């Protein structure tokens, strides 16, 4: 088992590494069709790289690279998309938002750290399972928490795994930087969940629409951090249609597998989206999702964050294109 995965570790140790500037990841509608889990892990190395977090927080080198590969292996392989690639697109949106969006001139590097680590810990060790499934399939982790149990577990595994061996990038942090780190990451991973995002978002939009937002008023700023977090948690939809076909028809088939669990180990009378029968009607029920979190958030992420506009546009392009599949 591990012998093959560590053979992949030599694939890290013995393969060509295309540059991130060659690999279009700075582009928001990026082609992740060709990247392997290894190459996406390398882009994740870029994500830790350019955010100026390593210099500002003294991260260890290979401890970070194998932070990335260890998170790459910890995901159960039965999962269709909510694995390492999901973290790849999420922190792709995070890295791109904090570099291509040039937000660093605004918000502090501490916050860039909280954004990145919470972005890669938006969905740690995701089992193809959301909050609801464990809340009703009753995995012990569910009883371990209450609200946003997967994400309370993602903060739990943030503070745990980063303190766990092979992952101590928190080691270089000063106690203040460390405090702001795990705390803002706490609230943000709570907001990495689309739900507690829906909870926190209204204060944000009220503080954004009037162009009255201020970064010398820090709680608003951290709330913006959480907004970018949720903006990143669903970023896979930003990807191009030939590829997006794969991505959101794996949203289809993977919520049809989790949905198979919804109609085997759960046996609910099916809800319209995750029913497989809506194979040519599921995308509309993605659009109503996109309207509910995506566009609603990327509008504010448009009027404050700037070059991050395509992160909105790169989603909207999918709309009708999925409506086509949603049009039988």
């Amino acid at each position: 088992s591990h012998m093959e995965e560590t053979r992949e570790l030599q694939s890290l140790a013995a393969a060509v590494v295309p540059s991130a500037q060659t690999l279009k990841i700075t582009d928001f509608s990026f082609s992740d069709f060709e990247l392997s889990d290894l190459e996406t892990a390398l882009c994740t190395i870029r994500m830790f790289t350019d955010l100026n977090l390593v210099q500002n927080f003294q991260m260890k080198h290979e401890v970070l690279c194998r932070w990335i590969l260890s998170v790459k292996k910890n995901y159960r392989k039965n999962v269709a998309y909510h694995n390492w690639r999901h973290a790849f697109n999420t922190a792709q949106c995070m890295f791109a938002a904090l570099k291509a969006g040039k937000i660093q001139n605004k918000l502090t590097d501490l916050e860039i750290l909280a954004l990145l680590i919470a972005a890669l810990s938006h969905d740690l060790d995701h089992r193809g399972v959301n909050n609801s499934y464990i809340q009703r399939s009753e995995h012990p982790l569910a009883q371990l928490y209450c609200h946003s149990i997967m994400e309370h577990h993602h903060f739990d595994q943030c503070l745990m795994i980063l303190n766990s061996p092979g992952n101590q990038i928190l080691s270089g942090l000063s106690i203040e930087e460390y405090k702001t780190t795990l705390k803002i990451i706490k609230q943000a991973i709570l907001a990495t969940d689309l739900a507690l995002y829906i909870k926190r978002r209204g204060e944000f939009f009220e503080l954004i629409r009037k162009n009255q937002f201020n970064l010398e008023d820090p709680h608003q700023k951290e709330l913006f951090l959480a907004m970018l977090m949720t903006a990143c948690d669903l970023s896979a939809i930003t990807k191009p249609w030939p590829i997006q076909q794969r991505i959101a028809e794996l949203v289809a088939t993977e919520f049809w597998e989790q949905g198979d669990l919804e109609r085997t180990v759960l046996q609910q009378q099916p809800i319209p989206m995750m029913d497989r029968n809506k194979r040519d009607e599921l995308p509309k029920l993605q659009v109503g999702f996109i309207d509910f979190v995506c566009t609603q958030l990327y509008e504010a992420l448009t009027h404050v964050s700037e070059d991050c506009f395509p992160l909105l546009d790169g989603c909207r392009k999918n709309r009708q294109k999925w409506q086509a599949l949603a049009e039988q």
Partner: peptide, 17 residues
């Protein structure tokens, strides 16, 4: 995860929970 009632059925038909 308490939220708006308008959202709940949507939570029951969108990707959230």
């Amino acid at each position: 995860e308490a939220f708006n009632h308008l959202e709940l059925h949507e939570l029951a038909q969108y990707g959230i929970i």
